[PDB]
């Protein structure tokens with residue numbers, strides 16, 4: 001092995017593993033075959049479904065156990081102290097589960113954690129009671145030749161919410177896992193997880209336990225989804241899986257809180273998308289027979305790898321499940337997972353559909369006077385509004401740098417990060433030259449973070465420290481083309497540094513290409529020195545080359561830099577054109593603000609061609625592009641005022657259209673008022689100038705001539721106009737029936753939907769509008785509560801047409817035959833015709849009027 005000898009003193013491979021051998025993640029993905037060859041539990045998961053045991057706690061509660069059984073009054077009701085004071089009772093329950101057909105039992109150790117046990121005066125006994133728990137299970141399982149799972153639960157204190165420090169929590173999982181490993185468990189099971197940051201904390205602590213003890217075992221991680229649909233601290237299934245896929249874990253799954261019914265969408269999401277094996281352990285009430293049917297569905301139809309029960313399930317539940325699942329062939333797991341990052345709340349794709357991945361930069365002390373002022377003044381409320389402003393303008397993630405000469409970086413992160421952890425809906429790109437700052441940040445930020453910058457500026461060791469940190473915490477990584485020779489300025493230097501960095505991150509450390517965002521630099525081309533004139537072109541040509549040579553990797557640029565030195569209008573224009581040029585060369589992400597760009601649709605053809613000449617350095621004895629480009633803005637200084645007066649001069653109707661296209665909120669309501677006073681009706685304005693404006697924005701976005709922030713600015717105008725016009729809308733009928741209406745899970749588009757709501761409401765239909773990103777469970781809760789004549793689902797993403805199909809499947813499975821009306825721009829009539837195969841009663845609606853006519857037909861025209 002070359003690689004075993006090629007470590008620096010910066011490498012920390014115990015937690016994340018390296019790029020070779022048995023590490024959980026390597027360049028090629030989840031290291032399934034190697035780990036199946038080393039570990040009998042994973043071999044078994046490949047070969048057959050593994051039946052878990054059922055509840056321990058609810059089994060213990062059925063024994064009439066006295067204070068004496070627990071060692072005294074102090075310890076009464078602590079399950080884990082029974083490992084010392086009534087071992088034979090814990091064992092008997094294992095024996096009942098094995099005799100019922102369980103091939104995997106869990107240790108009575110879920111609450112064998114320092115801070116949980118402190119309740120009973122047992123804080124110092126966590127390792128002991130965990131070790132005795134593993135021994136009890138070993139004693140029962142060894143005659144049966146079964147597996148033992150060392151079970152650790154979430155504890156009583158939520159780390160994302162500040163109720164315990166990462167370090168105290170880390171120490172609690174470590175010592176506990178140590179007990180389990182020394183006791184002979186075959187795998188460690190982190191279960192009933194409520195806090196996605198705890199998952200990261202405990203995974204890394206349990207890994208460290210393995211390294212300390214010299215014994216590695218598979219790691220299985222199960223979250224709990226509450227009846228509301230998320231983990232307790234607010235994490236959905238998508239964000240959960242995104243946060244798990246990049247960690248050193250073998251098996252992902254869920255347990256507790258609900259029965260399999262509510263669990264079904266979440267189990268199907270894991271079964272469908274995870275590269276790891278998948279487990280499912282529902283709570284119960286639920287009969288043995290019912291649970292056996294749900295696990296037959298989950299195994300045979302979805303490909304779930306291990307099945308058992310949680311709280312309320314007994315031996316009898318496991319008996320029926322083992323009979324139901326014996327002899328089913330496992331389905332193969334998916335081999336790739338789309339690159340995604342995550343906040344506490346939501347997953348975000350790194351390959352954004354039809355768009356760059358846009359990273360706001362205003363939370364950067366170096367680049368932002370406002371943020372700096374608010375940081376030093378400890379203005380939390382101001383920083384969160386700034387965060388929100390950026391997300392509102394389309395930021396998929398936020399770059400954060402607090403570093404400032406004169407200040408303690410670590411103090412400022414300790415102040416700010418606890419608040420960002422729970423406030424942000426989007427992920428954080430942690431921006432720092434200090435690995436210590438990075439490591440501190442990774443103790444506070446839930447989900448899958450980004451790290452802004454592995455580079456070779458300060459030696460291989462720092463590079464390896466950052467690389468190691470990213471591998472262990474499952475972070476995406478920005479790779480910056482700077483080495484011992486300095487910043488790479490030419491295409492040749494950029495490719496060479498990128499290739500060296502790539503090979504080290506993939507082959508040595510085991511990061512996937514998909515985790516990497518290569519930053520070839522952005523230098524100013526405005527200063528006007530002959531050195532600086534080709535520096536933009538060099539980045540663009542390097543990026544194209546590295547795109548063909550490195551499939552899978554991403555590219556990110558801080559684009560504003562290109563234009564440093566210029567006047568604001570010139571900057572906005574150069575930044576925008578550079579960004580589009582970079583997109584055409586392979587760019588996947590951009591660190592940029594909305595204010596520092598404008599739509600290409602708004603750039604005169606002459607400014608456009610001059611910006612091209614400057615970027616590509618089209619210099620002649622004829623003409624110097626920098627001077628020509630500067631001179632353009634000198635000679636069109638009045639341009640802002642010709643725009644404003646020409647805008648204000650337009651006819652009323654065309655002016656309404658223009659407000660949409662150009663995002664002009666200011667004076668909107670006055671124009672709409674003017675139109676209502678002249679006798680125009682609300683729906684005329686909506687269907688006419690306003691939606692014509694949205695049609696044009698769509699054409700420009702689809703043609704690459706308008707970026708996401710300006711589509712959001714058009715969207716805001718559109719929704720303000722509809723909200724102003726809605727109260728003036730003429731009603732046209734009386735109680736004709738009821739529609740439950742929703743945009744489906746994953747989708748935030750609602751302009752279509754809300755027009756539907758308004759047209760139907762005013763033609764005399766009760767519309768229960770459930771909003772955006774509505775899961776099928778909440779749709780059907782609404783169906784049950786309101787008993788409507790139909791259900792409406794809106795979908796504008798291609799992805800949403802697949803959610804609609806699955807929604808129809810979910811509805812068929814639970815007996816629904818109510819009419820379903822599907823609509824949205826992504827969805828065709830030919831496609832809804834085909835869904836009739838799943839669900840007879842499904843109808844397509846081209847528009848709100850077609851929706852109206854379908855409600856008319858389906859209620860007898862009421």
Ligand code: B12
Nearest residue numbers: 698748749750751752792794797798823824845847848851
């Ligand atoms: C506005 C807009 C946005 C706004 C939406 C704001 C809001 N709605 O609150 C914002 C900026 C939020 C947005 C974001 C994104 N969007 Co967008 N967006 C658009 C845009 C420009 C206009 C959509 C619109 O409002 N149309 C106006 C309404 C009136 O039309 P409509 O919704 O079709 O509805 C009519 C019919 O379809 C029907 N209908 C619709 N629903 C229903 C339901 C029922 C029951 C009935 C009876 C009828 C019915 O009736 C309506 C009126 O007659 C479209 C352009 C397009 N569609 O080609 C892209 C578009 C839909 N978006 C797109 C994309 C990709 C995205 C993003 C992924 C961008 C990104 N960030 O990477 C995100 C995804 C966010 C998410 N969903 O999770 C794509 C989707 C295609 C795809 N491959 O997935 C489009 C097509 C652009 C493109 N690529 O060309 N988007």
Ligand SMILES: N[C@@H](CCS)C(=O)O
Nearest residue numbers: 054055056057110192
């Ligand atoms: N393994 C635990 C789960 C706690 S919710 C038990 O069955 O009691």
Ligand SMILES: [K+]
Nearest residue numbers: 053054055309
């Ligand atoms: K169990």
Ligand SMILES: [Zn+2]
Nearest residue numbers: 006007008011
């Ligand atoms: Zn190493």
Ligand SMILES: [Zn+2]
Nearest residue numbers: 256257310311
């Ligand atoms: Zn439970």
